[PDB]
Design a binder for these strands. Structure first.
Ligand SMILES: [Mg+2]
Ligand SMILES: [Mg+2]
Ligand SMILES: [Mg+2]
Ligand SMILES: [Mg+2]
Ligand SMILES: [Mg+2]
Ligand SMILES: [Mg+2]
Ligand SMILES: [Mg+2]
Ligand SMILES: [Mg+2]
Ligand SMILES: [Mg+2]
Ligand SMILES: [Mg+2]
Ligand SMILES: [Mg+2]
Ligand SMILES: [Mg+2]
Lengths: 63, 183, 109
RNA sequence: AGGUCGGGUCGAACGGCCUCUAGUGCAGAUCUUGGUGGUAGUAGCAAAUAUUCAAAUGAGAACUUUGAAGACUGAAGUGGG
């Protein structure tokens, strides 16, 4: 499928960039059915679409 | 309809064609001439080997400044290539002609490609942008391909003309004298 | 026909990537692993695990390891009959060091 | 100079002779318009560090999507307006 619009909606809904969204490759059919921001919010709530963690920039060496 | 110049039995023949195929005419001509006159299954197997780079299509006419290769040794040539797109189109047409032949009710094992010809389709043109603000052409040379596969028949005929003879009186006398002088 | 066998080998990638351009070392390592599996198992359909891809690309392009322990399992092919009835699958073998080990056939249980 | 017949193709008008008339005969003019070649499957498609693996879709995937990995722009950014 083509989940570009799903990733864009998920980024705009969660509030992070597209680099931090995780669309699981097993629920591709349900993500493809998800065509609205409400359905994207449901997928985020039940954990199909996950917000990845921040890549750390540790300040220990400079401290 | 109205194929090229063929000399075969249409009752023992099947045909296929493809017009306005966006494939290079110079490569399809060599791909056709490589299999012209071949048995059908042998030609198909050879085309799959060409696609898998085990054998090559010899380039006879449109071959200037192409590279040399060892796989031309089969054909006594030094210049050969692997025109994959032309092989795809040609083997698709071969499959269509085999389907037409088995629909006609032909033997399907005596089938050899008797006729196959390629000629130039109308060009499909684009533009090229060259230095100092010039425009040139960037055109594809597509192909009309057609082929006729026929059943391999037996010996053609015998019993040539009567060959009427005209002999002078002197020649007749010589023949009669020899027939008298011998037994 | 027979020979669904699975083994563990050690590929010396150093002598295979000697002289290769730095930005092609890891893709050439992938291609040489495919060629190695074709040499040993005779199979042209070689599938590498993404874990093996990570083990190759763990140190960038030009940081490919010298020796790599591989598990190659020649499997019976499936899926809408293809060209070949056999396909090879290459897993990485987690180990401390890939040095000193010889190839061993592993039992399937 | 040209004319005539036969064969093939084609489908709707055309010729001989006596005269009249002219926008009346092409190989050229770096001629005009249009078309087509050899060159030639040739020159080439090489700036901007870099891509790889699996799965899905599909007739078909180096290039599409997802995931993973590796990278880059490096806030006088390849970002946001
Ligand atoms: Mg030359
Ligand atoms: Mg050259
Ligand atoms: Mg240009
Ligand atoms: Mg300009
Ligand atoms: Mg060197
Ligand atoms: Mg009419
Ligand atoms: Mg005039
Ligand atoms: Mg002229
Ligand atoms: Mg003149
Ligand atoms: Mg001129
Ligand atoms: Mg070239
Ligand atoms: Mg250049």
């Amino acid at each position: 499928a083509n989940l570009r619009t799903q990733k864009r909606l998920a980024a705009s809904v969660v509030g992070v960039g597209k680099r931090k969204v995780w669309l699981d490759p097993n629920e591709t059919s349900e993500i493809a059915q998800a065509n609205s921001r409400n359905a994207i919010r449901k997928l985020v709530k039940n954990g199909t679409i996950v917000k990845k963690a921040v890549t750390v920039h540790s300040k220990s060496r400079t401290r | 309809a109205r194929y090229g110049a063929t000399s075969t039995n249409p009752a023992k023949s099947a045909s296929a064609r493809g017009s306005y195929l966006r494939v290079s005419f110079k490569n399809t001509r060599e791909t056709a001439q490589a299999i012209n006159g071949w048995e059908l299954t042998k030609a198909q197997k050879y085309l799959e080997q060409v696609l898998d780079h085990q054998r090559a299509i010899p380039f006879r006419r449109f071959n200037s400044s192409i590279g040399r290769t060892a796989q031309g040794k089969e054909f006594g040539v030094t210049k050969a290539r692997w025109p994959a797109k032309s092989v795809k189109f040609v083997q698709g047409l071969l499959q269509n002609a085999a389907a037409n032949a088995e629909a006609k009710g032909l033997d399907a094992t005596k089938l050899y490609v008797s006729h196959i010809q390629v000629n130039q389709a109308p060009k499909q043109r684009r533009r090229t942008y060259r230095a100092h603000g010039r425009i040139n052409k960037y055109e594809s040379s597509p192909s009309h391909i057609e082929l006729v596969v026929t059943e391999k028949e037996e010996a053609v005929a015998k019993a040539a003309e009567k060959k009427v003879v005209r002999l002078t009186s002197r020649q007749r006398g010589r023949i009669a004298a020899q027939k008298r002088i011998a037994a | 026909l027979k020979d669904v066998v699975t083994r563990e080998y050690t590929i010396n990638l150093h002598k295979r990537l000697h002289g290769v351009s730095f930005k092609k070392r890891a893709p050439r390592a992938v291609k040489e692993i495919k060629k190695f599996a074709k040499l040993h198992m005779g199979t042209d359909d070689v599938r590498l695990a993404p874990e093996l891809n990570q083990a190759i690309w763990k140190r960038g392009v030009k940081g490919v390891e010298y020796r790599l322990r591989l598990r190659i399992s020649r499997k019976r092919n499936e899926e809408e009959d293809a060209k070949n009835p056999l396909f090879s699958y290459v897993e990485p073998v987690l180990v401390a060091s890939a040095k000193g080990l010889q190839t061993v056939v592993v039992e399937e249980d």
